[PDB]
Design a protein around this ligand. Structure first.
Ligand SMILES: [Fe+3]
Length: 156
């Protein structure tokens, strides 16, 4: 069995029923050199400041490939009601946590996650992903359930 990406996704993410942020984190880590399999699903920034490519979906979860060019960031957001886990494939990102504070949001914590490492995005959590490095950052995300309505905040 010489696995291709979608082949791995079905084999790992397809039978999940109500998975936890750690169920998702260990399943992402179960992908064989996910970095190579991920290409060529990586895309250049179209509508967003970052490349975003939805590549899998069911009633349970949703998988997207994200590409944050050097010195680019996402918005400050929550994932509606579906959690997310991501794994930086190649690159290094700064994940900033935000504190709920009205209609705007204040920075609460911040840290880096490197290739092969994941970021957990529990329910209600508000964050921002940026790329301070001079190289691009490619990430493999999983949301459960699929994102329905994220709310973008206007920070402190
Ligand atoms: Fe996010």
């Amino acid at each position: 069995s010489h696995m291709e990406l979608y082949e791995c996704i079905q084999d790992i993410f397809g039978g999940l029923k109500n998975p936890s942020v750690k169920d998702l984190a260990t399943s992402l880590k179960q992908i064989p050199n996910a970095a190579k399999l991920s290409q060529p699903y990586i895309k250049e920034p179209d509508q967003y400041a970052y490349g975003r490519n939805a590549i899998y979906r069911n009633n349970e979860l949703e998988i997207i490939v994200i590409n944050i060019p050097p010195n680019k960031e996402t918005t400050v957001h929550d994932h509606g009601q579906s959690i997310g886990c991501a794994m930086v494939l190649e690159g290094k990102l700064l994940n900033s946590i935000y504190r709920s504070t009205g209609e705007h949001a204040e920075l609460s914590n911040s840290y880096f996650v490197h290739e092969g490492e994941c970021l957990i995005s529990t329910k209600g959590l508000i964050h921002k992903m940026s790329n301070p490095t001079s190289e691009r950052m490619v990430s493999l995300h999983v949301y459960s359930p699929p994102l329905e309505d994220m709310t973008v905040f206007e920070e402190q």
